[PDB]
Amino acid sequence: LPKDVSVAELLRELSLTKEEELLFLQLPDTLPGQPPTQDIAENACTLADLTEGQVGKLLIRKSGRVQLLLGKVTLDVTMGTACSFLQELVSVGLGDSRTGEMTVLGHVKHKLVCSPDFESLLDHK
Amino acid sequence: PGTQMTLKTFHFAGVASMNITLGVPRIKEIINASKAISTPIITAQLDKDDDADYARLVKGRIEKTLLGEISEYIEEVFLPDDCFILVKLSLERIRLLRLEVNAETVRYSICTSKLRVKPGDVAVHGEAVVCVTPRENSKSSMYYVLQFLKEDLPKVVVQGIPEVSRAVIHIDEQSGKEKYKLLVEGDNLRAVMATHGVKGTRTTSNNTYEVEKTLGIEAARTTIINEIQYTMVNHGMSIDRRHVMLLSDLMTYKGEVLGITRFGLAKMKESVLMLASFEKTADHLFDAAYFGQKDSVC
Amino acid sequence: RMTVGKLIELLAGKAGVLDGRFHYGTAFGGSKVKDVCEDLVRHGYNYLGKDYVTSGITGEPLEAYIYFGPVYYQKLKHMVLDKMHARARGPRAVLTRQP
Amino acid sequence: ADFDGDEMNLHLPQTEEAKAEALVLMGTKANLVTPRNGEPLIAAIQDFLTGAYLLTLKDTFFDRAKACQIIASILVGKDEKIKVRLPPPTILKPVTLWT
Amino acid sequence: DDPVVQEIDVYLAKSLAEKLYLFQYPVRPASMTYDDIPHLSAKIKPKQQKVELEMAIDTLNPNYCRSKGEQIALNVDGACADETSTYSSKLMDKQTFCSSQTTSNTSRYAAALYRQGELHLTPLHGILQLRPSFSYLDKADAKHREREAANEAGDSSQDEAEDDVKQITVRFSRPESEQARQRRVQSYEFLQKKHAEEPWVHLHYYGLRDSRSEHERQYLLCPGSSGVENTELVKSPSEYLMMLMPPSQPSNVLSMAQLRTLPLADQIKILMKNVKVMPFANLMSLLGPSIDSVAVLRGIQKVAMLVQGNWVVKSDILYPKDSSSPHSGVPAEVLCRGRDFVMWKFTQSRWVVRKEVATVTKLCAEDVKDFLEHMAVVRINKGWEFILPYDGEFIKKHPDVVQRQHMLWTGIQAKLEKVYNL
Amino acid sequence: INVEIKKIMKANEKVTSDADPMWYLKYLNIYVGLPDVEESFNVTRPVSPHECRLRDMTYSAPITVDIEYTRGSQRIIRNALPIGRMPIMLRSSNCVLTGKTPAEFAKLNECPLDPGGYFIVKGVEKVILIQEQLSKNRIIVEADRKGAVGASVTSSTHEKKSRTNMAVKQGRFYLRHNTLSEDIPIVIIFKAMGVESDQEIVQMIGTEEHVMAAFGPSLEECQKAQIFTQMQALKYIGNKVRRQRMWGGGPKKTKIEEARELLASTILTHVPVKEFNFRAKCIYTAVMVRRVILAQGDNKVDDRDYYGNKRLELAGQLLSLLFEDLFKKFNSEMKKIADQVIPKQRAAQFDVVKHMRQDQITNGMVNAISTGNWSLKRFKMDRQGVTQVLSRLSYISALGMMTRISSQFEKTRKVSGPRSLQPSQWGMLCPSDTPEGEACGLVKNLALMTHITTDMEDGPIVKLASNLGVEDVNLLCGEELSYPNVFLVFLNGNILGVIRDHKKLVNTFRLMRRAGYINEFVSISTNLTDRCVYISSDGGRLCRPYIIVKKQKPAVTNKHMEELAQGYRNFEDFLHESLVEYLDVNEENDCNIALYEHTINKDTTHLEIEPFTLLGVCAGLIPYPHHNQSPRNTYQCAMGKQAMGTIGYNQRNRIDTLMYLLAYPQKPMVKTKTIELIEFEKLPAGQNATVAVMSYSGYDIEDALVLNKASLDRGFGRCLVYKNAKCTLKRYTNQTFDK
Amino acid sequence: ETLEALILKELSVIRDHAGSACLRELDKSNSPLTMALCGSKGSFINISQMIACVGQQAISGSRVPDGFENRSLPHFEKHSKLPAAKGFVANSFYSGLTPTEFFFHTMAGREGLVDTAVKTAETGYMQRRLVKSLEDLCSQYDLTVRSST
Amino acid sequence: MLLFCPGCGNGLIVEEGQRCHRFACNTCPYVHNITRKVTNRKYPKLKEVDDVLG
RNA sequence: GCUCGCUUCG
Numbered sequence A: 001l002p003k004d005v006s007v008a009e010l011l012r013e014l015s016l017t018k019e020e021e022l023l024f025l026q027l028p029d030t031l032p033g034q035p036p037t038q039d040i041a042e043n044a045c046t047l048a049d050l051t052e053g054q055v056g057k058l059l060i061r062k063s064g065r066v067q068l069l070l071g072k073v074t075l076d077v078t079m080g081t082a083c084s085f086l087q088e089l090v091s092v093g094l095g096d097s098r099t100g101e102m103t104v105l106g107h108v109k110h111k112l113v114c115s116p117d118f119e120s121l122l123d124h125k
Numbered sequence B: 001p002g003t004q005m006t007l008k009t010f011h012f013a014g015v016a017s018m019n020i021t022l023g024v025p026r027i028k029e030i031i032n033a034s035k036a037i038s039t040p041i042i043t044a045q046l047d048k049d050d051d052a053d054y055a056r057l058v059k060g061r062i063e064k065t066l067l068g069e070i071s072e073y074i075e076e077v078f079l080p081d082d083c084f085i086l087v088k089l090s091l092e093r094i095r096l097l098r099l100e101v102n103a104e105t106v107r108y109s110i111c112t113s114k115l116r117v118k119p120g121d122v123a124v125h126g127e128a129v130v131c132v133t134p135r136e137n138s139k140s141s142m143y144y145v146l147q148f149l150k151e152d153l154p155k156v157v158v159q160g161i162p163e164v165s166r167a168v169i170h171i172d173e174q175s176g177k178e179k180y181k182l183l184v185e186g187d188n189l190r191a192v193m194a195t196h197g198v199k200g201t202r203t204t205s206n207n208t209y210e211v212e213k214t215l216g217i218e219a220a221r222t223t224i225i226n227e228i229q230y231t232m233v234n235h236g237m238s239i240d241r242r243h244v245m246l247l248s249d250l251m252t253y254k255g256e257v258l259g260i261t262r263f264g265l266a267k268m269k270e271s272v273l274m275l276a277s278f279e280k281t282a283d284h285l286f287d288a289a290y291f292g293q294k295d296s297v298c
Numbered sequence C: 001r002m003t004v005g006k007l008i009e010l011l012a013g014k015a016g017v018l019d020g021r022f023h024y025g026t027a028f029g030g031s032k033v034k035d036v037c038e039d040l041v042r043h044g045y046n047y048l049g050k051d052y053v054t055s056g057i058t059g060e061p062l063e064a065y066i067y068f069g070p071v072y073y074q075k076l077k078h079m080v081l082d083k084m085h086a087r088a089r090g091p092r093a094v095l096t097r098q099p
Numbered sequence D: 001a002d003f004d005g006d007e008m009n010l011h012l013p014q015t016e017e018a019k020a021e022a023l024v025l026m027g028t029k030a031n032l033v034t035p036r037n038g039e040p041l042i043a044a045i046q047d048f049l050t051g052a053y054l055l056t057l058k059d060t061f062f063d064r065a066k067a068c069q070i071i072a073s074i075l076v077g078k079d080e081k082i083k084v085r086l087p088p089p090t091i092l093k094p095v096t097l098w099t
Numbered sequence E: 001d002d003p004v005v006q007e008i009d010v011y012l013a014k015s016l017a018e019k020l021y022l023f024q025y026p027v028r029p030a031s032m033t034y035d036d037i038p039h040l041s042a043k044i045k046p047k048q049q050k051v052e053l054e055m056a057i058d059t060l061n062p063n064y065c066r067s068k069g070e071q072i073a074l075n076v077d078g079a080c081a082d083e084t085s086t087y088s089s090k091l092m093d094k095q096t097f098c099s100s101q102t103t104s105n106t107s108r109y110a111a112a113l114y115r116q117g118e119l120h121l122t123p124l125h126g127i128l129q130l131r132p133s134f135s136y137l138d139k140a141d142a143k144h145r146e147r148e149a150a151n152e153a154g155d156s157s158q159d160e161a162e163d164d165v166k167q168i169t170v171r172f173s174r175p176e177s178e179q180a181r182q183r184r185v186q187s188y189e190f191l192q193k194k195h196a197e198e199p200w201v202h203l204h205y206y207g208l209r210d211s212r213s214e215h216e217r218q219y220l221l222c223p224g225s226s227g228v229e230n231t232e233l234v235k236s237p238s239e240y241l242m243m244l245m246p247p248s249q250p251s252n253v254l255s256m257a258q259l260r261t262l263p264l265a266d267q268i269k270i271l272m273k274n275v276k277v278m279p280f281a282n283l284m285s286l287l288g289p290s291i292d293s294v295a296v297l298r299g300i301q302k303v304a305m306l307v308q309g310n311w312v313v314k315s316d317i318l319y320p321k322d323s324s325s326p327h328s329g330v331p332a333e334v335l336c337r338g339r340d341f342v343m344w345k346f347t348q349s350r351w352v353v354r355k356e357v358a359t360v361t362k363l364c365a366e367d368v369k370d371f372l373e374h375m376a377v378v379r380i381n382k383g384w385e386f387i388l389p390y391d392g393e394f395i396k397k398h399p400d401v402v403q404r405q406h407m408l409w410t411g412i413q414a415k416l417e418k419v420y421n422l
Numbered sequence F: 001i002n003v004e005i006k007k008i009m010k011a012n013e014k015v016t017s018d019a020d021p022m023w024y025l026k027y028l029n030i031y032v033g034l035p036d037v038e039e040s041f042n043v044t045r046p047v048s049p050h051e052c053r054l055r056d057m058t059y060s061a062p063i064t065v066d067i068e069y070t071r072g073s074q075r076i077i078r079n080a081l082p083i084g085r086m087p088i089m090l091r092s093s094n095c096v097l098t099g100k101t102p103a104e105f106a107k108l109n110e111c112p113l114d115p116g117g118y119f120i121v122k123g124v125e126k127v128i129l130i131q132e133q134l135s136k137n138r139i140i141v142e143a144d145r146k147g148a149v150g151a152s153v154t155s156s157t158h159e160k161k162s163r164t165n166m167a168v169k170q171g172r173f174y175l176r177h178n179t180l181s182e183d184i185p186i187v188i189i190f191k192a193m194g195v196e197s198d199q200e201i202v203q204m205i206g207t208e209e210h211v212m213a214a215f216g217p218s219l220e221e222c223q224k225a226q227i228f229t230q231m232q233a234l235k236y237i238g239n240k241v242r243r244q245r246m247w248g249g250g251p252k253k254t255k256i257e258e259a260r261e262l263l264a265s266t267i268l269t270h271v272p273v274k275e276f277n278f279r280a281k282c283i284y285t286a287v288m289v290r291r292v293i294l295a296q297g298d299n300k301v302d303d304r305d306y307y308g309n310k311r312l313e314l315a316g317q318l319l320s321l322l323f324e325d326l327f328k329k330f331n332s333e334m335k336k337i338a339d340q341v342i343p344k345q346r347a348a349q350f351d352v353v354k355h356m357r358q359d360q361i362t363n364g365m366v367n368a369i370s371t372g373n374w375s376l377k378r379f380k381m382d383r384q385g386v387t388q389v390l391s392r393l394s395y396i397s398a399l400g401m402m403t404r405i406s407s408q409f410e411k412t413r414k415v416s417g418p419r420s421l422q423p424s425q426w427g428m429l430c431p432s433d434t435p436e437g438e439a440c441g442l443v444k445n446l447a448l449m450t451h452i453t454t455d456m457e458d459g460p461i462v463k464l465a466s467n468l469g470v471e472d473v474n475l476l477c478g479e480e481l482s483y484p485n486v487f488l489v490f491l492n493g494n495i496l497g498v499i500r501d502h503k504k505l506v507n508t509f510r511l512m513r514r515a516g517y518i519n520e521f522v523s524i525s526t527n528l529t530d531r532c533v534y535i536s537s538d539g540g541r542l543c544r545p546y547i548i549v550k551k552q553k554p555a556v557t558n559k560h561m562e563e564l565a566q567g568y569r570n571f572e573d574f575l576h577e578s579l580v581e582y583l584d585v586n587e588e589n590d591c592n593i594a595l596y597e598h599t600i601n602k603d604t605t606h607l608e609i610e611p612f613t614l615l616g617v618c619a620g621l622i623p624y625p626h627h628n629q630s631p632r633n634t635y636q637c638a639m640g641k642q643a644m645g646t647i648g649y650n651q652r653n654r655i656d657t658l659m660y661l662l663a664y665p666q667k668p669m670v671k672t673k674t675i676e677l678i679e680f681e682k683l684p685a686g687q688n689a690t691v692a693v694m695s696y697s698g699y700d701i702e703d704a705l706v707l708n709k710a711s712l713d714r715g716f717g718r719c720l721v722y723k724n725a726k727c728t729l730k731r732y733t734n735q736t737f738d739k
Numbered sequence G: 001e002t003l004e005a006l007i008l009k010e011l012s013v014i015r016d017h018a019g020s021a022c023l024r025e026l027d028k029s030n031s032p033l034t035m036a037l038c039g040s041k042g043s044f045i046n047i048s049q050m051i052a053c054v055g056q057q058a059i060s061g062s063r064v065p066d067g068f069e070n071r072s073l074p075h076f077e078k079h080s081k082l083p084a085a086k087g088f089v090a091n092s093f094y095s096g097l098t099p100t101e102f103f104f105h106t107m108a109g110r111e112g113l114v115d116t117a118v119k120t121a122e123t124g125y126m127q128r129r130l131v132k133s134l135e136d137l138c139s140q141y142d143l144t145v146r147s148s149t
Numbered sequence H: 001m002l003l004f005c006p007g008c009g010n011g012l013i014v015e016e017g018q019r020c021h022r023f024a025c026n027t028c029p030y031v032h033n034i035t036r037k038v039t040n041r042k043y044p045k046l047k048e049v050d051d052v053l054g
Numbered sequence I: 001g002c003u004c005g006c007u008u009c010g
């Protein structure tokens, strides 16, 4: 199996087929934002502090560039380690303090890695 | 000359391979009279020194060849009725190397120091097919000892001397005629001389212990003299033959090649004071006090 | 020993003491031989250091030219006066009665 | 030895028998050859091979004065009680030259 | 390389932020799944997450050895005890999968559900690796030990009533040394007991084929408009770089950046101390175009003097009152007087003779040489020439500064004529 | 003396005894102060190093500390209480010689050109040579005596150093450690460390067919035994554990516990376990097994002489270890005195001030510096020849001896394996400068332009690595370790994680280091054969400055050099502006360096500053050394270390046991730039003579030379020899004195 | 190994041809040539090295091994088996040696030094053993060599 | 070759049952009967025909 | 004066 690329991956996921797919992307430790009214400090800003709605755009440039515009800065998305073992994304919802529900949402096949474009951040200032 | 010797390299003696210890380490190995030496060399002469086919034939006869070196594939097939190991001999490579090895010779090679494999276990189906069906020995061994065979079945000797590790065809390009000889990097002179097609009357060796054990003490003395003289000439420095003759005679005057080490010196000399002064002072002195050996001043 | 560096140093030092300069013997560089040769030929000396020399003993000129030049010689601490030794009967050791 | 700081030892025997044995067995004239292969070790060395080579070259031609000087350069010690025996010159008609 | 196509939007959902777990089987390939395997139960703990799945495996399949199943069932449990049995029947029917915690914090990990033109991200509350646990063998070994104890007790057919009354072996609750107490706390048994102190929670299993799976799968999405400007995530690249890389906390010691971090007066002073000869345009270029020229001029007028249109650092700046000559040890006042005399000679004439200065100032050769090397170069047959050429542009641009420096040099010349008796 | 000593004091700030609780001795802050002499009665006095040389005393400063303790449960504080004497290195921060002018040096009778950096003890000058050793926490694949290609790892933490090995003696891998009676199969250790499935073990080892074929025998041997769970493997390991000769305390069935503790703490100390989680240790041993399997084929055996795996310990680390050991011994002695005095003496409350002996640390430091033998029982280090007498034969002698480096081999035998000149010594160590004799090749000299790195905080390195996409090793199985495009990233021997497309990672890390957000001494290298990205941040590594080359043009231009000459910028400005950067041996292994501008090609990353910097200090005196033979250069360095000449400007007031001076020394006419750099022309050690190369009178046959009588009569070669005769008139115990 | 042998052969061809050219172009009365002809000191090889071209630097009878990864020095490309990148010295002692050539020459010199250092002790021990073993024999008057006993 | 049980992941050995040879694990009742031929070749390196030197 | 270590020397 040849090593695929994220641009062709998304292209075949949307153009070649229309079936939905579950992905597992690794975001950096700190996102380029501030915790909104979270009682602070320049601390880590993760997805647990952000609200719902559109938070960023995914751009696919020429020559295979795959970027993620999360505001003023732009990260880059690359393919992670090609896992071949079974990865099941499930939802374990403890609705009651005594009985909970485990909901198998789907299967995880591909892994993405999002990284800060440090070169652009350096040449900017 | 030991100080004069430079301990050079690249002196492959015309074969551009077969790194041999020459110089002060070689002189040390010679004078120590060790039973096992580093890189032993055996020169064998051929009855038909002009034919290369005969040279390669006797080379295959003397050189140890493993089963995996000639078999093209060995596969452990687990049929629904029984499981066994099938070895396919490459007859093309066999006739290329001119080895006198068939399916029957391979079968006879098996059942020799291999967990006591019974003759009924090994069988022949085709012209170059060997089928091995092992059985549980009940000594902490089950059928899943097949893997053990997979570890050592290709490492069995089918033809050649087990002590012989590598033999090469050296050629002399004399203007009168180009003759063929065998250079064997093994430690078994008797087997090389006993092989068919090898002129054993003109076979020498570097290991003095093997020469002593095989052809007598005088042959060992002659081998010591020739080897020391050759090692000395390799460095461009010359020594009168009388010195090396006296050394060989001193090493071979009690009927056994005794080295210059403390053991050989103790076996040759008798004076307690010299044995104590050279090495193992306290041990020799206490042993002499125990034996009450009177030491002269000769 | 193939110490051509000594000859180059001698030539550079001769050129320097002729023109009142300090030539450099920097590794993988320094003053080239052509420059010191031009400095020698400019001052009226030979471009190779070899000069016509008359023997002091016989008073006759030598058949071959002599390579003259200033060389930086350094004296070492190893002296014959400190290394010269002579031993009479002298004292002996208490344990073993030897010098 | 190479005369670059070698320290050598010098022993004095205290017995007539030892002195005689040293002079006879270990005499310099009696040990001109090594016992290893009989090759002579005490022989000419640098500045003696080159000097004799340049001397015995075919280009050398000495007049009477220079030849007499070179011959007399050795007439010291036990050679003070022998005749010089100046050899006849090779070339004599144009110029009297000793090779 | 412009973004020609695939301008996918990214949405965020917080519905399953605390209920989303990632289960990965390191020993099970992705080809074979547990969709057809009927699960029985799942033990879990809210804190210190470690889930144990208990599933059921078939027996009538040809891939199961009923004899070995009976053997292992008789080994793990008793004959017909069945009070606490790892298997309900006499065959190995239940399988246990134990989870290991990969990392403590999983905030940087997120699950991405991709739909046509959108990608929804959901944070992960925890990630665990599920592996087949071997726990029935431990109970089998414990049962074998108790059976060995029973066999030891059964050496005789009838065992007399043993007078093995438990003598009161109440041990001293010794005050444990702090080192030994730390060793006990860091012991594996203490950690395992602390983990076991938390009660277990039982959960049922709902497979992917269940309708509840597709029902709750929609919770990974979020209701929102296609185009919405996020209030947060608006920091500049410099602010982001400062966030993801927080800080830890001769006379030319200070670097250029450390210089620029200092006030303008200190910058001018250090530059004049280092170079000691530089034009005004070079100083403006080094300090930066964002600094006004009047401020730089006022700063340099306090630490430098005008010589032939160039600026030379003052003598007292190079030689403080407590310093001395490194070559002769004379006080710094004499060095300042000599340097002022040299600068005055340079203002009067471009060529300065070293011997004349040495004679007038009565100083040694090395001090005069150091004074000249700071502002002059050796020109053969001409003496010492000022290193920089006559800069008439700065003189034409600022005549008032020229007049101020001229009257200052007049005062300095008066002082020098009073001192050295010129 | 400014940072490390405070950390050592903080590590042992509180000391208390078990008996009579609520009693403690708390250290607050420690100071070393300025050097002083205890000659005056209970009064200190500033003393110059030359005075210490003359009076045959030590040049040290009083180590004091402020403390708080409890005498009778009442807190008593001391603000200035001396506890020892630290010998002060010359020209250091606290040394009186620093920040002084040559006139002030003359006032103190000290040469301004003196290199310094040496200790003065009892009147003698001792220099601590730079120690060279193998890097710690690194896997070494090497062949054994029988030819078996095994592995070894010397995991060294701040407390314990343990060398664990792995062998293939019988086609299967056995793990050998000093705490185990017999080497046990690696699969049993795998099962004991949490991972019990054999499939996971095989995936961690590798997915290559030859890897499985090689690892098959180990799995078969493991399946021969009944070891299948973690408990069984731990019991088997504990059976192979021997008690440390009846360790005090009731065991109470510690067998499995001892096995687990040895697996967690003793085995692979450098690999840390968070809470008894051997996942990282499992991955580490799996990578080690994979390396052994790969090395069992093609003979890619790592070499010990590669200086990229070498570390240099200066006097700082040695003095830190010695001070830590001495302070621990002092604290133990104080605790023993407390335990012996407090519970039985009297109602007169015991205080440590009456028992704080101040001679302990002082005598320890003095003896360790003077005798040169260091015996650290806390670290079990028994070293000798650490300090050597500074040679005052000449200025060049001392200047070259100050930059010496000794080998760990500690020559006693003919190794002839480190004595070779490895290509890794380029730019770091002088190739020609070596003592001719038995110490040939094991005593070396640093190059003219070199630097030794210190330790870093290692925090921002981990942060940048985690932010750069390095996946956590605990998140994925070992199968990803067998992929051809997955590269392992390490950190000082610890597995930092995995990565894909390591080129981007390396480029970003180098650019961030050039920007200044990462320390310039942090090195990053890539090994494509093993597919491992090494990130080194420990101290002792050798680094060399190189000009950065981007697109066939160096970053340094003529304008930058003009600004440097005029004084606009310094070397730190070149470092900050991404113009010149430090390269390590491991890092320069992957970089392309050009000797000159004309040699720069398309694939060039750095440019050599100056080639003549390859030679050392002693080799710098050689005029035109590239025109001579290497043994000639070595002999010249050896003789220049013994060259006679002036020592310094204070050579007249200096009184040594043996001094050689030249009557009329002259600076050489052909001087190297190194001579101008080291200011040798101010202190020459020879004379220029009109030499004529010819044969004369046959008195110059072999290496001899003929001298002129008139030349020697006019002062040529005239020398002076100064010897010292010292006598002592000491007062004995009885009230009688030598007169 | 075939490529290594061929490259060594070509470098030796260059060396010997340059030496022959230098010996042919040299005029008589040349002091190095004169001392080489009479054999007092030096030889034609030293003259060729110091005048025409230095030979291939050989370590243990082979080219310079790769100290770094797949290359001897970082100044050359990876997997580069060029002569100048493996020990060859194109320039002579008169013209001056490049830093890489000087480093290789120093490597060879240090190899020779350590070889002699080991040889000294090894032959000392061998000589001690041989003399201690052979010191008893003596030539008698009956032309028969007999031991002490 | 090396085969592992899908149940627990331990190595599978080859034994003989009551009907046919089968792969089996030593820690679980999982078995797998052999239906068709199974082979695992290795292709050992052939002893290269050495040539005469000189 | 004994011992050991370093250092040089050929």
Ligand SMILES: Nc1ncnc2c1ncn2[C@@H]1O[C@H](COP(=O)(O)OP(=O)(O)OP(=O)(O)O)C[C@H]1O
Binding pocket: C001, F631, F632, F635, G120, I010
């Ligand atoms: N360890 C030693 N054992 C015996 N003799 C030695 C030792 N060290 C030096 N020597 C004496 O010094 C001499 C060694 O000189 P040698 O090696 O032939 O020249 P060299 O030192 O290589 O000089 P070049 O470098 O060739 O100029 C021979 C020997 O008598």
Ligand SMILES: [Mg+2]
Binding pocket: D001, D002, D003, D004, D005, D006, I010
């Ligand atoms: Mg000598």
Ligand SMILES: [Zn+2]
Binding pocket: H004, H005, H006, H007, H008, H009, H010, H025, H026, H027, H028, H030
């Ligand atoms: Zn199984």
